[PDB]
Amino acid sequence: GDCHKFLGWCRGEKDPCCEHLTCHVKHGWCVWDGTI
Protein backbone atom coordinates (compact mmCIF):
# COMPACT_ATOMS: atom_id res chain seq x y z
CA GLY A 1 0.00 0.00 0.00
CA ASP A 2 2.14 2.85 -1.31
CA CYS A 3 1.74 6.17 0.51
CA HIS A 4 0.80 9.42 -1.23
CA LYS A 5 3.83 11.57 -2.05
CA PHE A 6 4.43 14.89 -0.29
CA LEU A 7 2.34 17.82 -1.55
CA GLY A 8 0.27 15.30 -3.47
CA TRP A 9 -3.53 15.25 -3.62
CA CYS A 10 -5.88 14.64 -0.70
CA ARG A 11 -9.03 16.45 -1.84
CA GLY A 12 -11.59 13.89 -2.96
CA GLU A 13 -9.61 10.99 -1.52
CA LYS A 14 -9.65 9.73 2.07
CA ASP A 15 -6.49 7.62 2.31
CA PRO A 16 -3.48 7.72 4.67
CA CYS A 17 -0.18 9.43 3.84
CA CYS A 18 3.51 8.62 4.25
CA GLU A 19 5.43 8.72 7.54
CA HIS A 20 5.11 12.01 9.42
CA LEU A 21 2.27 13.10 7.14
CA THR A 22 -1.48 13.71 7.36
CA CYS A 23 -4.06 13.85 4.58
CA HIS A 24 -4.90 17.56 4.50
CA VAL A 25 -8.53 18.11 3.51
CA LYS A 26 -8.42 21.91 3.32
CA HIS A 27 -5.04 22.30 1.62
CA GLY A 28 -5.50 19.12 -0.40
CA TRP A 29 -2.10 17.50 0.09
CA CYS A 30 -0.18 15.56 2.74
CA VAL A 31 1.84 17.87 5.00
CA TRP A 32 4.54 17.35 7.63
CA ASP A 33 3.27 16.54 11.12
CA GLY A 34 4.76 15.23 14.35
CA THR A 35 8.26 16.39 13.45
CA ILE A 36 8.87 19.63 15.35
- Indicate the domain borders of the chain: 1-36
Going from the C-alpha of 25 to that of each of 19, 32, the distances in angstroms are 17, 14
CA-to-CA distance for 33 and 5, rounded, in angstroms? Answer: 14
CA-to-CA distance for 35 and 26, rounded, in angstroms? Answer: 20
Technique behind the model: NMR
CA-to-CA distance for 14 and 11, rounded, in angstroms? Answer: 8
CA-to-CA distance for 10 and 27, rounded, in angstroms? Answer: 8
Residue 10 CB-density burial (10 A; 0-12 exposed, 13-18 middle, 19+ buried): buried
| Cβ-based neighbour number of residue 6 at 10 Å | 13
Phi, psi of 7 (to 5 degrees): 50, 35
33 near 24, Cβ under 8 Å? no
CA-to-CA distance for 35 and 1, rounded, in angstroms? Answer: 23
CA-to-CA distance for 14 and 4, rounded, in angstroms? Answer: 11
